[PDB]
């Protein structure tokens, strides 16, 4: 399989304070769990999507949503390599889905509605930036660790 | 299950078709990897840790086919493949861009001009 | 066979078709000779430096077949065969009728009721 | 007094490349002197086991920076069994000690003996300790007698 990162955005409450969670797997293992509460993808890894969480949280606070427990959820999908590229895919809670694609810096909505948000979001040439910057950050280890599984 | 291993060198350590040979001769790095080339071979590589389980006993230390490129501090073998921390642990000394590899699937790294005995490794095919 | 060592157990180390693995688990004297046995083969036996050369490398103490007969405090192989003085030098701790092997062919006498790694080998037929 | 063996594993640098010292004294006669940089039957013996005990504790340290410090006394035997003291110290922070004869230890405190803990499961580096006494424990003592 790839290297999957899953991030979840979400509001603290009492019950559970957590507003980030980032969980990385390999196929069915475990190699990354994140959150406000393998060695060297690990090690890479942790900053960026730190860093990446808390932009992400910021975008989350400007956009305009419809719908009848708000939430975002991406998933970064990394195959191995063997010039190195990714898909980021957005699901703004469970109603606007759109999807960036690193390797051409191309970008696909599900609908008009999608699209709206997803050109506001992606007109932050820092945001963009992190998407594709943390893929050649750790690519190279990527590759390495998706090798040793085989 | 009882097969055989090779190709290898006459007098070599074979096994799962990888060759080894240690030789006792104190040479450079760049020395050292001359001897081995010369019998199509390379320094000593560190693919897998699995495979490669019994070299962890081997005692003192020797020049294998790790080198560093100062500019980026990345650390490569020969064939340009990445070290890989599941290979081995490389404990860096602020001056040196060879390293030793020293039992235990450790690797120091020294400078390259320094005279060492090596590890000639050909892989299997 | 030309350029290839064996015919050796599978994933063994093979050195002029004698076939050499080194075994991870501790046990005791005779439960390593029992392990030996079950596989064809027996502890590692010394039989000559020149050809066995990079043992010399091997690090850390295994259970090899040397043997004590206390009677007169000789030592010798499973098989029957004498230590030589040129196969290895012999360090007597003065409790022990069994023998670790610790490089450089040197070997330390030690409890035979002691859990160590031990070493099999399969000389060549 | 005794024959003792003090023994400096650290890390080099580019002021001094030194990553290990031995210096073995019989009270104020230096005797031995190894290191990485550059009497005769007892330096004979105790020389490649000082080095491959040095290259142990090298691989033990990178496992634990750290500059150790170690001191091995060994006493004229006598009619008894040869036997000496380890004594180890860790960056000035944890200490402990090795005994030969009955393969026994002493930590410090609580937090050396977490480390002494981890450091004596290694079997080949305890045998290293008591083998290099029985090794070289004659041509002490041949000495010791000098």
């Known amino acids: 399989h790839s290297l999957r990162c899953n991030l979840t ?32 993808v690990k090690k890479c890894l942790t900053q960026p999507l730190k860093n990446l969480c808390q932009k992400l949280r910021n975008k989350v606070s400007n956009t305009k949503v419809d719908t009848h427990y708000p939430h975002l959820q991406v998933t970064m999908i990394y195959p191995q390599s063997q010039t190195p590229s990714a898909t ?63 | 299950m009882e097969g055989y291993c090779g190709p290898c060198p006459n007098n070599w350590i074979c096994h799962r078709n990888n060759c080894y040979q240690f030789f006792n001769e104190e040479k450079t790095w760049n020395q050292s990897q001359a001897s081995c080339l010369s019998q199509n071979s390379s320094l000593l590589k560190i693919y897998s840790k699995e495979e490669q389980d019994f070299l962890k006993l081997v005692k003192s230390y020797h020049w294998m086919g790790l080198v560093q490129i100062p500019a980026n501090g990345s650390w490569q073998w020969e064939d340009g493949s990445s070290l890989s921390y599941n290979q081995l642990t490389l404990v860096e000394i602020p001056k040196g861009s060879c390293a030793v590899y020293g039992s235990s699937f450790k690797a120091y790294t020294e400078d390259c001009a320094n005279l060492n005995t090596y590890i000639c490794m050909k892989r299997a095919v």
């Open chain 1, 88 to 150: 980021w895919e957005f699901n703004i809670s469970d109603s606007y889905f759109f999807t960036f694609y690193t390797e051409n810096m191309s970008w696909r909505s599900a609908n008009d509605e999608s699209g709206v948000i997803m050109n506001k979001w992606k007109d932050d040439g820092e945001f963009v930036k992190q998407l594709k910057f943390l893929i050649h950050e750790c690519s190279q280890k990527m590759d390495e660790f998706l090798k040793q599984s085989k």
């Open chain 1, 9 to 40: 955005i979400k509001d603290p409450t009492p019950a559970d304070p957590l507003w980030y969670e980032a969980k990385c797997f390999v196929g069915e293992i475990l190699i990354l769990h994140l959150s406000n509460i393998a060695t060297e």
